[PDB]
Amino acid sequence: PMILGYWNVRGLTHPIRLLLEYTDSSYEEKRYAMGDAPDYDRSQWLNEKFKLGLDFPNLPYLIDGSRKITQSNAIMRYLARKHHLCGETEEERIRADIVENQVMDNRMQLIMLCYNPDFEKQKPEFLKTIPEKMKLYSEFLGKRPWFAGDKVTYVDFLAYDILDQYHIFEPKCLDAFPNLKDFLARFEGLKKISAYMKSSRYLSTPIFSKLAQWSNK
Amino acid sequence: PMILGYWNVRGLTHPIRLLLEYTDSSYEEKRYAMGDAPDYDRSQWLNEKFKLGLDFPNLPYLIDGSRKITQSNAIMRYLARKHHLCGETEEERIRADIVENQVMDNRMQLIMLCYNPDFEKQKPEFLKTIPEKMKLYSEFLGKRPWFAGDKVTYVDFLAYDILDQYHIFEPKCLDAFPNLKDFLARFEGLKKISAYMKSSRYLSTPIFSKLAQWSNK
Numbered sequence: 001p002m003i004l005g006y007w008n009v010r011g012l013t014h015p016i017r018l019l020l021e022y023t024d025s026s027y028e029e030k031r032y033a034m035g036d037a038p039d040y041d042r043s044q045w046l047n048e049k050f051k052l053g054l055d056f057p058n059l060p061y062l063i064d065g066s067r068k069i070t071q072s073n074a075i076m077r078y079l080a081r082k083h084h085l086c087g088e089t090e091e092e093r094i095r096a097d098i099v100e101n102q103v104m105d106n107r108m109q110l111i112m113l114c115y116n117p118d119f120e121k122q123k124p125e126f127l128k129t130i131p132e133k134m135k136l137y138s139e140f141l142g143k144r145p146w147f148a149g150d151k152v153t154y155v156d157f158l159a160y161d162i163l164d165q166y167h168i169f170e171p172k173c174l175d176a177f178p179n180l181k182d183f184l185a186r187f188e189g190l191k192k193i194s195a196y197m198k199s200s201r202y203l204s205t206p207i208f209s210k211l212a213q214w215s216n217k
Numbered sequence: 218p219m220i221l222g223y224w225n226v227r228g229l230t231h232p233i234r235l236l237l238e239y240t241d242s243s244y245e246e247k248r249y250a251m252g253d254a255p256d257y258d259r260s261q262w263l264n265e266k267f268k269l270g271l272d273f274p275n276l277p278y279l280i281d282g283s284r285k286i287t288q289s290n291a292i293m294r295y296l297a298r299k300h301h302l303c304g305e306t307e308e309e310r311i312r313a314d315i316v317e318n319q320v321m322d323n324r325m326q327l328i329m330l331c332y333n334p335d336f337e338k339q340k341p342e343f344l345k346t347i348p349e350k351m352k353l354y355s356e357f358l359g360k361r362p363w364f365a366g367d368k369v370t371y372v373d374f375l376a377y378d379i380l381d382q383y384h385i386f387e388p389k390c391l392d393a394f395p396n397l398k399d400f401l402a403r404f405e406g407l408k409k410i411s412a413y414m415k416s417s418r419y420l421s422t423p424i425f426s427k428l429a430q431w432s433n434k
């Protein structure tokens with residue numbers, strides 16, 4: 001099968017995993033793992049970083065046959081194209097482009113705070129920043145089944161995961177937004193997702209590496 | 218006319234600007250201007266932040282009549298799409314997608330350095346990494362005319378931009394890379410581009426904002 005390479009954690013690859021499962025893809029993984037304190041070895045990835053034929057070597061990577069892909073989003077779009085999970089209208093398309101990109105921004109923000117040396121102090125500030133992010137998501141989604149509109153598409157995977165980690169981080173975070181609440185629920189109800197969540201392949205935590213300041217085991 | 222909103226610096230919007238020009242889109246701009254130090258007043262933008270009908274208010278933004286778009290890549294594909302500047306085949310789309318995210322990776326690495334108080338102490342280290350990056354681009358492009366292949370697409374705008382910024386950062390960086398130098402001249406030799414760089418609307422620098430440690434002014 002296809003080979004998904006990434007680190008020993010959730011990080012930014014959950015959407016890929018989920019989607020491979022949703023699509024009935026055949027794949028196996030390679031989960032490199034860093035060593036502990038105090039170096040945090042990377043040797044397992046390093047030794048073959050420039051040995052895999054990847055154009056711009058990085059984690060995660062997807063090896064599908066003769067196709068070698070890097071960049072989380074490109075991976076997502078490749079698999080999206082392979083299975084007809086892209087938006088099919090320009091509106092669906094525009095919505096998807098947007099979600100795709102807002103997701104990473106919100107992701108980068110969570111990540112910045114989780115690696116911040118002064119996590120404790122700047123944070124309650126972050127928490128008060130939440131509601132408003134959620135607010136954007138609720139209103140964008142609206143009355144809609146899925147983020148692009150009437151069709152499940154790959155952004156629904158991106159969306160589900162960040163909404164989840166945000167929710168993981170601030171449990172009440174969704175209380176103000178029902179429809180949001182409903183979406184995870186509806187997402188979790190997709191074909192193979194439920195099985196997958198209960199499976200031995202599921203990797204829900206840690207979201208981050210040891211080093212972190214939050215979500216590190 | 219469409220309206221392009223962005224700060225009054227190059228930032229990450231250069232690619233849109235080139236594309237609009239290249240596609241001879243009818244448009245107007247609103248280059249919000251930040252105040253100086255020690256406050257960096259952001260009121261020009263802030264005053265209209267939440268009134269533009271934007272899904273997730275941010276900059277840049279593009280308003281094309283009824284349609285409101287945020288997230289640059291989003292912006293670039295929308296326009297790419299109205300003028301057939303997207304990959305046409307599976308191979309093309311994969312290259313374009315990778316490149317799309319890869320530019321954004323190399324981009325943030327730059328800003329990261331450029332807003333780091335410790336900038337002079339970090340440079341030396343950053344400079345080391347540069348050739349390694351150009352090489353990745355030189356090799357990926359190889360003997361293709363365009364980043365995705367035979368035909369120009371919106372990802373060349375993304376590419377020209379980043380490579381140009383790096384070059385600007387370290388003038389010699391494209392020396393070992395004829396491939397690149399040549400891609401740059403070709404890009405810059407495209408009629409509406411040449412034409413635009415000589416226009417009143419051109420804005421090559423500053424690239425970062427006022428609170429940046431490099432290309433701030």
Ligand SMILES: N[C@@H](CCC(=O)N[C@@H](CS[C@@H]1c2ccccc2-c2ccccc2[C@H]1O)C(=O)NCC(=O)O)C(=O)O
Nearest residue numbers: 007011012058059060071072073111207208209318322
């Ligand atoms: N833009 C790229 C991300 C590239 C990225 O930085 N890759 C990181 C892993 S994600 C990385 C990370 C590592 C551990 C734990 C968490 C994260 C993480 C989580 C979310 C978002 C981003 C990250 C990065 O810090 C990496 O280690 N790449 C290979 C290398 O540099 O040799 C993409 O979309 O794929």
Ligand SMILES: N[C@@H](CCC(=O)N[C@@H](CS[C@@H]1c2ccccc2-c2ccccc2[C@H]1O)C(=O)NCC(=O)O)C(=O)O
Nearest residue numbers: 105224228229275276277287288289290324328425426
């Ligand atoms: N992911 C979004 C970019 C979002 C981004 O951070 N926008 C910055 C503009 S780019 C941003 C930037 C700001 C000032 C000066 C330079 C830059 C810049 C330049 C190049 C690359 C990245 C940046 C960011 O700091 C911003 O001020 N958004 C509005 C807001 O926060 O309300 C996109 O790709 O469109």
